[PDB]
Design a binder for these strands. Sequence first.
RNA 1: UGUAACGGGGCUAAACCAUGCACCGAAGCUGCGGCAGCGACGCUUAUGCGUUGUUGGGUAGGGGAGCGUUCUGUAAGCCUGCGAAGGUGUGCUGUGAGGCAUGCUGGAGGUAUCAGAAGUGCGAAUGCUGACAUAAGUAACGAUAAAGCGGGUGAAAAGCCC
RNA 2: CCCGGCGAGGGGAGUGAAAAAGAACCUGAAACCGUGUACGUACAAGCAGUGGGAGCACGCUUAGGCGUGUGACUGCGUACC
Lengths: 142, 47, 103, 56, 110, 117, 150, 37
Amino acid sequence: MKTFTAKPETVKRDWYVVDATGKTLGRLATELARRLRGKHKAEYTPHVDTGDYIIVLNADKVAVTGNKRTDKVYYHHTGHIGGIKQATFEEMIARRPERVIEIAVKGMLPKGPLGRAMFRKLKVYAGNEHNHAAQQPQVLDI
Amino acid sequence: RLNTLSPAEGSKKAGKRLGRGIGSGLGKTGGRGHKGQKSRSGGGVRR
Amino acid sequence: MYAVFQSGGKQHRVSEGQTVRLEKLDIATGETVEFAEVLMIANGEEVKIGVPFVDGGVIKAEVVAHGRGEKVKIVKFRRRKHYRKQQGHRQWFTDVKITGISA
Amino acid sequence: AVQQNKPTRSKRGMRRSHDALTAVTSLSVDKTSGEKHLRHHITADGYYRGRKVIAK
Amino acid sequence: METIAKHRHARSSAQKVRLVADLIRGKKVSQALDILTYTNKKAAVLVKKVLESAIANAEHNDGADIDDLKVTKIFVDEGPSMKRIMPRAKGRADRILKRTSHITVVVSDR
Amino acid sequence: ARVKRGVIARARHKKILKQAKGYYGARSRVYRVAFQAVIKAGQYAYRDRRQRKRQFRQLWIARINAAARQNGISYSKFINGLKKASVEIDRKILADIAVFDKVAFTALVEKAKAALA
Amino acid sequence: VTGSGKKPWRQKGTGRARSGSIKSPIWRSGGVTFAARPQDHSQKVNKKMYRGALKSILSELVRQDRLIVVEKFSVEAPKTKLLAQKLKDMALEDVLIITGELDENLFLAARNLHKVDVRDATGIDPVSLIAFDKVVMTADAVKQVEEMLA
Amino acid sequence: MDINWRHNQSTFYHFTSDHRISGWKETNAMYVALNSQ
RNA sequence: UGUAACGGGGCUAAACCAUGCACCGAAGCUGCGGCAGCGACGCUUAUGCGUUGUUGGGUAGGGGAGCGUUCUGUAAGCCUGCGAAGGUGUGCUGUGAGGCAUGCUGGAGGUAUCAGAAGUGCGAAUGCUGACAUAAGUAACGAUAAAGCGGGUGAAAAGCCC
RNA sequence: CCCGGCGAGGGGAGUGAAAAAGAACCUGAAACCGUGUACGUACAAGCAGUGGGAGCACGCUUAGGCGUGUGACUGCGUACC
């Protein structure tokens, strides 16, 4: 016979809420990337989005070690020529902290159409409450 | 019985045909290597 | 109730009445074989192997059809060095049908 | 100044996706003669807005 | 019942005709004639003559009733090119492909 | 004896172009490009008869690693356990049990933890 | 090839490939590369190999019962009807009659029959002993054949 | 037309002009070569 | 040109050092199935097998064995208007070049087997010839002396005639 | 006979065994250009395949879970001489 393949019409996938207070950024990020791929499920299939929907909250309260609070620099280029634009970690936490968790997880997820579809399942909030009470996210303690 | 006569075994050897394909063994350069005076038509030195 | 057994080179997880395509066995077409080297029997209670192959288990399988599989082309081209070699291959198989699994 | 790979027939039809002609889209019916004409134009019999004009 | 008219060897390239053919494809016939009367192309004259010929072949050689007919198929094949010569500068010549086409209108009531 | 070569050349070209149906553009129309496409497809097909064995194995390992961590042990410790428990089930079958029969996989994890302790 | 040795374009500067003659074998209308000449296809057969070959084929015509030895074989009048009836009576259709003295009437009687060929004992060849189904030798032809083949 | 096309392809086959590429095409190749020296 | 000297995320260990036990990891080795070469060996003896060992990446190049094409003999035979060659599909088959059967088109030739001879196999030569694309419905429509209107002819008039 | 400009071209009728044998005439390939249908394709980067592979559409098929077409998504992959 043939190896089982998950079918994306019939993938059941759950909702999880994770409190990101005082977690380390990379270690949380790597756990979220694992859950959004669907690597924790026995029906994992590399071309099917099998993962779960995670609601990260308290994104502004995430922690980093060392002097990464001030020395970790987020560069991006704008397309216009001298457009190299940097922003440290504390400037990002002040401006938009959702971008901190989302940049991390996005760089841990496979690049391509599927990993974009995998990132659409991450919902990050800078506060303590979310609109998604209808989906009943159970508390993923990680 | 003129369609049952047949030569000896080993008497008619094939004949090298050079220049036909990759499988045949003698294609492209026909067995005469890369450039030089010897790989040239008419090419060769005297006795 | 399924059963995992070892066969020619590799392993097969098979229920009863299921046709399996194995490697070429040296058996006649309607003849019945037995695999005495079953590695798992699960019905609603698992039975598997501390020391391997289960002590009381055997699979009786009736041979259905010897055959020769789909042709595959084997292509060996070395770019730019005047070498290519094509070849073909049809693997022999043996379809058996699982008559019964005895735990 | 000249191409460097021959363009496909794909890219050729993509360029011609806009070369389509638009239909008329509906042409209007005269008041008196009851015949059809482009709007704001005179008819083939030479009427316009229900009165007789040209008459050649 | 399908009824055909063709203009073989029409002096207009098939591209230029296919614009007009793409207008009237699928229409009822009186509507197609009203489109070709007010399209300002040379190809609309050619296509209109083939369409009028197909309505006439339908009503005369087959069953009548113009008002039920529809332009089911219309297509413009390419015909043979007339190979001529344009004298260019510095003594060089070109081939001009004076292109023809083959207009086909299949009209039908069903 | 002049030999015209139209009919046999047509047959070879046609053989190659039938092996290139479905390719984009000239790759399915023009002989001179369909020959290269057909060969490069041959080389890839060879290469990938080896890679499918590698790819399936890494898929199975990821599924046994998922289901085994669902039962509280890693893949590394699980395979060590079953080898010490002298279980010889290959990992196609462990992946397939790990999908279809969760209870049998639970019992295999119990043999692995039993021998591994 | 009927042309001229004028070079069709200048050696350099046209973007054409370089060419030197309009009679090149790569050009249409151009002259075969290794054009044939009238040639002789005769092989030497050694005399003892020719005689050896005749001895082998005669021995196999005897061994396969394709060799019929009659005492006399002559026709009454030069008519193909008479030879057709005579060969019909002897159960022979495809036949090589070989006679030590070439009869005129037999020769004229076999000249229209397709399968039938009359030879003198002198002029037999390997391809006819092998070609025809039955060979009918006159006894005189047998003696002359043994004198030829020693 | 075919005869005129064969002869009018045969126009610059035996040329001499060196400043014009292929007998006819204008260029700057005199300055390119001359500057390379 | 842009982070831009960890591949990247990210890491205070996911760094380094020391020890240890796991696991991943190749076309390596093993398992199962198949083919071929060279030895050895008991028969079979003009060779195949119960075997058996071992080998099989390959350019220039050497050696061996084949397939197809056209033509001659076999052939005044054998296929063929109940339908040939050719063309275009499908199915089966051989390690391969290939082979075989058959639907549709075609409309009169084809040729087993075993030999014989080669204008005997093309993707390249800024190859030769024909056809057809591409740019592309693009530049241009050949003096910047200049046209406007009425009428006629016509299926149709900026251009013809008045 | 009909459309058409007493055209070109065509549609019928008729001859013909056959006029997609109609004089642009035996066969009628390929490039190239179309029309129709099934599938895919408008948030996605690259020798355009290949290994895996969902879904959909046609045929089956005593549902046997196959075959053909397409091919989302995914690993690997920089043409030939």
